[PDB]
């Protein structure tokens, strides 16, 4: 049986993927780049703060100074951090709190595999910190999503092999990172966005311990 579940945060635990999209789109438009729509944003889900800004600049074949790049990333983060101040336990996605409780009752380890430097603050806002056996620090890994490093680090932090873990993700980059770690991915979203080659569920109510067992067994 699987021995750990490795959680993405934004778009899996709560609706902060929407917040990141709105913030990046506002930033892009301030600098005169209008291509950041929902379809383009599928390429930004899972990707780090600096990598996201670079993808937006590259979309428009735009170059900025190193000083301006740093300011833009900070500006977006400052806006996003203001956006999330009122996040609360009421914003936890359907199924997620009960899943965490059921995993702990069954002695299955729980680790955060998020790229977000705002992850710890968000888990505290949602009264979820006490469910987590480890939080992988994204500043410590040498490579970010779609590289598998963050999922590998999360598994190691709870003493479990990636091959005996399930990863939960809403992003193209993150699904690839789970695949390359050795863990089993279960995606949440549209197969049109996430692929027809892994198990995908339409919303997080589907993330029950019963279903995770169903998928693991086959
Ligand atoms: O800017 P932060 O809080 O470090 O977040 C980094 C990344 O975290 C990931 O979880 C999101 O899917 C990305 O959209 C985001 O860019
Ligand atoms: F949406 Al994440 F790390 F929380 F990619
Ligand atoms: Mg996500
Ligand atoms: Mg604790």
UniProtKB/Swiss-Prot annotation:
Chief site of localization: cytoplasm
GO terms for biological process, alphabetical: carbohydrate metabolic process
Resulting phenotype, residue 46 to P: 100'000-fold decrease in catalytic efficiency
EC number, UniProt record: 5.4.2.6
Source species, domain of life: Bacteria
Binding site for beta-D-glucose 6-phosphate: 10, 46-47, 49, 116-118
Gene3D superfamilies, alphabetized: HAD superfamily/HAD-like, Putative phosphatase, domain 2
Activity versus pH, per record: Optimum pH is around 7. Relatively stable in solution within the pH range of 5-9.5.
Molecular function GO labels: beta-phosphoglucomutase activity; magnesium ion binding
Binding residues annotated for Mg(2+), in chain numbering: 8, 10, 170
Disulfide feature: none
Modified how: Autophosphorylated.
Cofactor note: Binds 1 magnesium ion per subunit.
InterPro entries attached to this UniProt entry: B-phosphoglucomutase_hydrolase (IPR010976), Beta-PGM (IPR010972), Beta-PGM-like (IPR051600), HAD-like_sf (IPR036412), HAD-SF_hydro_IA (IPR006439), HAD_sf (IPR023214), PGP-like_dom2 (IPR023198)
Effect of residue 52 to A: Wild-type activity
Active-site residues per Swiss-Prot or TrEMBL entry: 8, 10
Expression induction or repression: By maltose, trehalose and sucrose and repressed by glucose and lactose.
Cellular component terms (Gene Ontology): cytoplasm
Transmembrane segments: none
Site entry (Important for catalytic activity and assists the phosphoryl transfer reaction to Asp8 by balancing charge and orienting the reacting groups), positions: 114, 145
Subunit description: Monomer.
Stated family: Belongs to the HAD-like hydrolase superfamily. CbbY/CbbZ/Gph/YieH family.
Protein known as: Beta-phosphoglucomutase
UniProt organism field: Lactococcus lactis subsp. lactis (strain IL1403) (Streptococcus lactis)
